[PDB]
Design a protein around this nucleic acid. Structure first.
Ligand SMILES: [Ca+2]
Ligand SMILES: [Ca+2]
Length: 287
DNA sequence: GGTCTAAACGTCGTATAGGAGCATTT
DNA sequence: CAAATGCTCCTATACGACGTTTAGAC
């Protein structure tokens, strides 16, 4: 059985909290509904069934992508019990909090009033992309509810495993560089990318893993390039607390290249070619 | 001077997140 | 009816993932 913290982390990466407000058969003229969803590439449904098995709720689909969705009041109650017990720690937590207030309004059927509808619109206004042009036009001078800035340490190894399984990256960097014998440097790279709103979170993870540097481009990158930070810290970490989903295979290929660099012979033409073939067949070049 | 590692810097194209809205059941 | 939710399709930009140069150790 899959761990709950793996679930929260993975959701921290890939989930969405939504409120749909559609013109409508009804007295306020508007329909209000909450949605919670997690979406992945089609190849990873087994994770969803397992997660589904843990919570005992969610409806799964597989088409152009794979999604598990929670749309009924009871299932979202299951979702809320989960994230209340095993809380989110990225900025998406703030989205969660808006969703949760709205959900409760909806549970009490307060959404069927102009007053209640409007309060819900105040929650939706600060939720994700906020109010659409259509909704701004139909309901102007709306003041958006305040959104909590979440400011947080790593709760569990399985959380990191879920988050890296969504947003993490293992890639091989090849740089044209004449000062090297092969004409190329080979680097094993671990990376996490996140909007700057959570730099604190990134930093506790750096602290949590005892390695990596921050690169700022707004976006932030956690980047690990050091070979025996990679060897003696990152890989053992994801070795006891497993990366899940299709991304593991990339991780394994990443390990193989790390092994090749570790035996110091990636610095030969035959070896550099070898690593190149593997890199071109990992991550996006996989087809 | 040469070889190399670490990492600071640079940047593009699909893949997510987010969304919207009609159909069926409760 | 009307309220909830099942079901499916739409989209556009912030991560992924790829590439180059620099600081400097050995
Ligand atoms: Ca992802
Ligand atoms: Ca993301």
């Amino acid at each position: 059985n899959i761990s709950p913290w793996t679930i929260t982390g993975f959701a921290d990466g890939e989930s969405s909290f939504m409120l749909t407000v559609s013109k409508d058969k009804r007295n306020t003229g508007w329909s209000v509904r909450p949605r919670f969803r997690i979406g992945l590439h089609n190849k990873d449904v087994t994770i969803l069934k397992s997660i589904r098995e843990y919570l005992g709720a969610g409806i799964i689909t597989s088409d152009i992508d794979a999604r598990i969705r929670f749309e009924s009041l009871k299932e979202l109650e299951v979702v809320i019990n989960h994230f209340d017990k095993y809380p989110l720690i990225t900025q998406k937590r703030a989205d969660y909090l808006l969703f949760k207030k709205a959900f409760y309004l909806i549970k009490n059927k307060e959404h069927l009033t102009e007053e209640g509808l409007n309060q819900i619109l105040t929650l939706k206004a600060s939720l994700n992309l906020g109010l659409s042009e259509e909704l701004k036009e139909a309901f102007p001078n709306t003041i958006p509810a305040e959104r909590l800035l979440v400011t947080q340490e790593i709760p569990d190894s399985n959380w990191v495993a879920g988050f890296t399984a969504g947003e993490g990256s293992f890639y091989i960097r090849i740089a044209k560089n004449s000062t090297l014998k092969t004409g190329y440097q080979v680097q094993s790279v671990f990376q996490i990318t996140q909007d700057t709103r959570d730099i604190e979170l990134m930093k506790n993870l750096i602290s949590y893993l005892n390695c990596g540097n921050i690169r700022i481009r707004t976006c932030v990158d956690l980047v690990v390039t050091n070979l025996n930070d990679i060897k003696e810290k990152i890989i053992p970490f994801f070795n006891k607390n497993h990366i899940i989903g299709v991304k593991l295979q990339d991780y394994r290929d990443w390990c193989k290249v790390v092994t090749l660099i570790d035996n110091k012979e990636h610095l030969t033409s035959e070896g550099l070619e070898k690593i190149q073939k593997i890199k071109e067949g990992m991550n996006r070049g996989r087809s």
